[PDB]
Every structure is written in structure tokens, then in C-alpha cells.
Amino acid sequence: PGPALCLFDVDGTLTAPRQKITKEMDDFLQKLRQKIKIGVVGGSDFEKVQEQLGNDVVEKYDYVFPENGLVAYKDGKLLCRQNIQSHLGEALIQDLINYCLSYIAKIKLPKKRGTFIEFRNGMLNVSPIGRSCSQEERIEFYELDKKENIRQKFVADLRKEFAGKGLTFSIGGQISFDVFPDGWDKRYCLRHVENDGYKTIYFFGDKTMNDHEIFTDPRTMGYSVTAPEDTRRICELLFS
């Protein structure tokens, strides 16, 4: 119905895991773009996106959203930027940082290395243990955090001392847990597409991590695919 947009998650949906897009796929998308506009979003960076979809990616898609739209492109122009310290404000960053630093120093573990706090543009990857832990170190701490649940213990107190700062927490993997402003997941990019006159906004990607929010957000018509061949089968089924 009316003007529409197709937004695709990058790795997995448009390419084989850890690989650049296919010629067939690429030619398919440019062909699809003829009638309906297209866009891509992913948690990775533009450089990584370039590796997967090509260095001229901003010319192949109408919208390009690396870092979940925290980096946006449309028609080839750098729409804008946004980082956690600008949105949340420095003094807000240091309050979270300070706290985690002093809290982390009070946790006896079998091993400690470095990068107890990693700083991403739109997310603070913490960890009571660090981040550069080895292969054996990581598994060790992981099996240890199994029964201990050290992470949930901290990811709960933080929610308290900082209750109300529009911050969302997230425990993932075996050693670290991400921190970030509310809505700063793939849904963030939607803000670059809800004002260009689209009656329908399709999304193609992973619908479950638990649950991918962009896939459920009311503005999108979710279509989770299992690989690039599916993205085409559905796009073929839906369009053309």
C-alpha cells in the first residue's frame, strides 16, 4: 500500500554469516529497489558493512544504518551522528563509569585482566571481570558465573542507583553486559524512516535474540528470515 520501504538487518539476512553479499543477491536488491526503496541496519560499523555489502554500500541502498542507525545514510549523505555521552551527557557518563569502577573493584574472582569497562559510541560494555580475558579465562569465569550469577547481581543494583535515567541493561555472552539509553537497539533507525511518507515499513532480520524489538515495534511489518535466500523468497513473494 502506497509508498513503502524495506529495511534489512545486515549479517545473516543479506549475507552468509561472516561473508560479503552475493552477486545474485546484490543484483536482486538493486532490481527490487527499482519499485520499492530499501535500507539496511545492523549493530556493526560502516567499514564492517562495507566488507559485507561492498564499499559503495551508500549507493546500493536508499538508507544505511550501521550501529543501529546511530550512523545513518540516505541517498549517500551522512545524515547525522549520536553518541552515548552527547545524548546522556558527560557527567551522566562519569556517574555510571565511576560507580561501575568502584563496584567492580569489590568483587573477588579467580582471574582479572583488563578492559573492565569498554566504551562504545551508543553503549557501555561493562564487566566485573574485564574483557581481554583469554580463551580458558573466559570459559572459567563463564562456568563460574553460571551458579554465581555475578552479572545479574550487578545489573540489578545499577538499575537501582540509576533508576530513572532512561537506561536499559543487558547481560549477554559469557563475560560482559551492555548498558545503553532506552530504545537504542535496531529500533533507533526507525526514526529516520517514519517521516518520508511510507505507508508500510518492512523489516527483515532476526526476530529473536528473546525478542528483537524492531521486529515487534508497531511501525514495522516484521519478516524474520533464516538467510539471504529466504530474504529473496519472501521479497519475491511479497513484492514483484
Domain ranges of the chain: 1-82+185-240, 83-184
Q: After what residue numbers is the chain broken, C–N > 2.5 angstroms?
A: 209
Q: Provide the strand spans (E) within 42-107.
A: 63-65, 72-74, 77-80
Given the residues 9, 62, 145, 185, the one annotated as active site: 9
Taking domain 1-82+185-240, whether its CATH number is 3.40.50.300 is answered by no
- Comparing 1-82+185-240 with 83-184, is the CATH topology the same? no
Q: Is 226 annotated as a binding residue?
A: no
Length of the chain: 240
Residues 6+ apart with CB under 8 A from 23: none
> Do the annotations mark residue 196 as ligand-binding?
no
Determination technique for this entry: X-ray
DSSP 3-state of 72: strand
Give the start-end residues of each E strand in the chain: 4-9, 37-41, 63-65, 72-74, 77-80, 118-120, 123-125, 167-171, 177-181, 200-205, 220-224
| 26 labelled catalytic | no
CB atoms within 10 A of CB 73: 24
Rounded Cα–Cα distance for residues 56 and 213 (Å)? 29
- Resolution (angstroms) equals 2.1
Active site residue 11: yes
Instruction: State yes or no: 206 annotated in a binding site.
Output: yes
Q: Say whether 81 counts as a known binding-site residue.
A: no
CATH annotation of 83-184: 3.30.1240.20
Of the candidates 11, 62, 145, 185, the residue annotated as catalytic is 11
Residues ≥6 apart with Cβ < 8 Å to 29: 14, 38, 60, 61
Q: Is 120 annotated as a binding residue?
A: yes
